[PDB]
């Protein structure tokens, strides 16, 4: 078995190997990358996402989200308070202000320490979940707006044609902005490109051990667990590496820098934080190997998770028994 310790693997494809996206994902899996839940892909030196980032300031963040924490430093939830719209230039200036800017630090490990010590005492503002793309239309390789769609994959594997679309999302971050512990909708893959700015630190649980994280989460968030049998789908709970280690949960960590891709694999729980002002683009995708995970994915039916239009068909075709209850949750 390849990668039996489930370490995060880092890949350096050549420009030739960067042509065929599906083929390269399958290669990475042949080497055991999926066992970690997360892999890093450093693009060939010849590649670029677009020519410059000099003209992005007028993108609108219609609903910036202030991420307010509750709990203790290593075990907390966050809720998202909606703020007034602002442009990316306005958000960048806010990220760089004395109130929100990254503190002085020695290195990524020192910054990580400071994040876990102090996150809960601040409420950073995240420009998350903005439909759009920063890839130039002429970028032919690993262009996250030009990937094969999940609907087409389902149709190719299973023969059933379904409605829905699959487009990317932009994330404008600042110091301490946080992504809570989650797997993707329908335990899909994700791919995330850090276009510019400061790093993003990731934590990940191997897919084979995901249920250990779920059992811990039920213990640490006991009211949430009574409310919903899949409350991590709400994407609000944080648990620190120190608490994971104290509870014997297997995990790994890695820091993504500008110019790098990350791939999350089906049922790979992940969480993390931004170091400072940055912009990432991410999208879900599927492969043949996903289908079995999609059929088994948990679902939130309490009403909280509320998701895209395109998840309807995935539930309806892959999980017909669950469909009625899940759809009630959506309505």
Ligand X SMILES: O=C(O)CNC(=O)C(=O)O
If you ran DSSP here, which 8-state letter would residue 168 be given?
-
Residue 228's binding partner, choosing from ligand X, Ni ion, Zn ion, none, with beta-carbon cut-off 5 to 8 A by kind? Zn ion
SS3 (DSSP) at 294: helix
The CB density around residue 224, as the number of other CB atoms within 10 Å, is 18
Q: How far is the CB of 184 from Ni ion (least distance, A)?
A: 5
Residue among 180, 148, 156 nearest 67 (CA) = 180
Binding site annotation covers 83? no
Nearer to Zn ion, 208 or 304 (CB): 304
Figure out which of the listed residues 56, 150, 282, 300 binds ligand X, where binding follows CB under 6 A: 282
CB 102 within 8 A of CB 195: no
**What is the helix (H) or strand (E) element at residue 87, kind and residue range?**
strand 86-87
b/e for 297-306, b at 16 or more Cβ within 10 A? bbbbbeebbe
- Measured CA to CA, the distance from residue 115 to residue 67 in angstroms comes to 14
CB 183 within 8 A of CB 261: no
CB 182 within 8 A of CB 271: yes
Nearer to Ni ion, 56 or 262 (CB): 262
Tell whether residue 179 is a contact of ligand X (CB under 6 A): yes
Question: Count of residues binding ligand X (CB under 6 A)?
Answer: 9
- Measured CA to CA, the distance from residue 282 to residue 127 in angstroms comes to 13
Figure out which of the listed residues 196, 302, 307, 317 binds Zn ion, where binding follows CB under 5 A: 302
Using alpha carbons only, what angle is made at residue 239 by residues 124 and 61, rounded to the nearest 5 degrees?
25
Figure out which of the listed residues 49, 86, 239, 280 binds ligand X, where binding follows CB under 6 A: 280
Site for Zn ion in 208-247 (CB under 5 A): 228
Q: How far is the CB of 56 from Mg ion (least distance, A)?
A: 5
Residue 58's binding partner, choosing from Zn ion, Ni ion, Mg ion, none, with beta-carbon cut-off 5 to 8 A by kind? Mg ion
- Measured CA to CA, the distance from residue 242 to residue 163 in angstroms comes to 43
Encoded one letter per residue, x for contact with ligand X by CB under 6 A and - for no contact, window 235-264 reads: -----------------------------x
Nearer to Mg ion, 56 or 297 (CB): 56
If you ran DSSP here, which 8-state letter would residue 221 be given?
S
Nearer to ligand X, 133 or 190 (CB): 190
Which residue has tokens 């276009």?
195
Site for ligand X in 186-205 (CB under 6 A): 190, 192
List interacting residues with ligand X (CB under 6 A): 128, 171, 179, 190, 192, 264, 270, 280, 282
Q: Which residues are annotated as a binding site for Fe cation?
A: 182, 184, 270
List interacting residues with Zn ion (CB under 5 A): 228, 300, 302, 304
Q: Which residues are annotated as a binding site for Zn(2+)?
A: 228, 234, 300, 302
Q: Which residues are annotated as a binding site?
A: 126, 182, 184, 192, 200, 228, 234-235, 270, 300, 302
């Amino acid at each position: 078995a390849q990668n039996p310790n489930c370490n995060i693997m880092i890949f350096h494809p050549t420009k030739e190997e960067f042509n065929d996206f599906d083929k390269y994902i399958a290669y990475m899996e042949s080497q055991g990358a999926h066992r970690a839940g997360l892999a890093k892909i450093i693009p060939p030196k010849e590649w670029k996402a677009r020519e410059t980032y000099d003209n992005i300031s007028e993108i609108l963040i219609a609903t910036p989200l202030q991420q307010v924490a509750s709990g203790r430093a290593g075990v907390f939830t966050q809720y998202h308070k909606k703020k007034k719209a602002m442009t990316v230039g306005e958000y960048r200036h806010l990220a760089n202000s004395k109130k929100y800017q990254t503190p002085p630090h020695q290195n990524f490990e020192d910054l990580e320490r400071k994040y876990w010590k102090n996150r809960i005492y601040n409420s950073p503002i995240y420009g998350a979940d903005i439909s759009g793309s920063l890839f130039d239309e002429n970028t032919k390789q690993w262009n996250l707006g030009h990937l094969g769609t999940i609907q087409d994959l389902l149709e190719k594997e299973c023969g059933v044609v379904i409605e829905g679309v699959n487009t990317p999302y932009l994330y404008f971050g600042m110091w301490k902005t946080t992504f809570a512990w989650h797997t993707e909708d329908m335990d899909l893959y994700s791919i995330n490109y850090l276009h510019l700015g400061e790093p993003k630190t990731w934590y990940v649980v191997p897919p084979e051990h995901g249920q250990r994280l779920e059992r811990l989460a039920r213990e640490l968030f006991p009211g949430s667990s009574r409310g919903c049998g899949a409350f991590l789908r709400h994407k609000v709970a944080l648990i620190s590496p120190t608490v994971l280690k104290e509870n014997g949960i297997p995990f790994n960590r890695i820091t993504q820098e500008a110019g790098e891709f990350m791939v999350t694999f089906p049922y790979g729980y992940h969480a993390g934080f931004n170091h400072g002002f940055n912009c990432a683009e991410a999208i879900n995708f599927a492969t043949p190997r996903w289908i079995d995970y999609g059929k088994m994915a948990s679902q939130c039916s309490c009403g909280e998770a509320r998701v895209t239009f395109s998840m309807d068909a995935f539930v309806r075709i892959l999980q017909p028994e669950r469909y009625d209850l899940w759809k009630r949750g959506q309505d």
